[PDB]
């Protein structure tokens, strides 16, 4: 992963989806979020998960620079994830403010 986001540290405020997450022709998922915080620049926590209690990462994050570079509120960013097959969950953010969206990918 890029050091750029790591040195920013993780974004702490709440994210919100801006539109329904959309499948690509490759079966990956593109999901856009809006960030409520003013602590940018910061790194967007973004993963797929099947177990909401362990939050063990499944699939992978494709986005090369998953960051919010603006310090003004309500900035948007697009994440792209490679989901596992079957049912899973998009998980954006960390802690009590994280948001989730169910996802299903066929061809297990």
């Amino acid at each position, epitope marked *: 992963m890029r050091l750029k986001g790591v040195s920013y540290s993780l974004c702490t405020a709440a994210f919100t989806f*801006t*539109k*329904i997450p*959309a*499948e*690509t*022709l*490759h*079966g*990956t998922v*593109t999901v*856009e979020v809006q960030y409520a915080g003013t602590d940018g620049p910061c790194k967007v926590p973004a993963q797929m998960a099947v177990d909401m209690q362990t939050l063990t990462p499944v699939g992978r994050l494709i*986005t*090369a*620079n998953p*960051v*919010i*570079t*603006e310090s*003004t509120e*309500n*900035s*948007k*960013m*697009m994440l*792209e994830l490679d989901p596992p097959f079957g049912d899973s969950y998009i998980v954006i953010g960390v802690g009590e403010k994280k948001i989730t969206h169910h996802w299903h990918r066929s061809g297990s």
Partner: antibody
Amino acid sequence: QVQLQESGAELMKPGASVKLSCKTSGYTFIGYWIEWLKQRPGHGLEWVGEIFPGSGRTKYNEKFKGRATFTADTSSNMAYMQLSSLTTEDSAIYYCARYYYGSYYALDYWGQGTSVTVSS
Amino acid sequence: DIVMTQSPSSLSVSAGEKVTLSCKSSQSLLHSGNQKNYLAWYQQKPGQAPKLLIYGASTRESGVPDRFTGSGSGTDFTLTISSVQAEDLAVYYCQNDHSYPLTFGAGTKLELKR
């Protein structure tokens, strides 16, 4: 709010080269593509090409014969289109627009356009 | 390249009418992996940049009024305005979003009947 602010109107001589800019706000500049479009009266919209400023990757419509070059300054959230060997047929409004290749979200936010007039 | 054909180029309308705009592509805009048609519709008023209305052939961009409906698949697409209003008077473009180079139709202009 997502905004793309383009540079002011240009008056160029034939054979010259123009540098247009597009400064963005409201989103992570290095996370999306900038697409460049050409609109002149009598024609619809024509795609010039694209740059992904976070990487430098660029793609061009062959019809421009290599006369366009896209660059970016990520510290300014600015994308540039240079169009060289201008002719009167390059007189047009040029737009930049935000894009995410791989998605089908299409061209969702557009700059206000820069007018270019090419005349001797 | 993919050619986008809009016909007719102009259409005279009255407030409250149902209007259907046509758009045809030279080859299919369908990607079989996600079974989505990569077709977008834009609205342009004079002195303004185009505005995105519909992406993926049928999905309305946030904030676009519900009276705009995109439909169709493969090579034949339509934009329907169920009850046209005065603010809908504009030029409408469809766009090949399927593969490069991106290409656009020549547009259909809505004008007012009298």
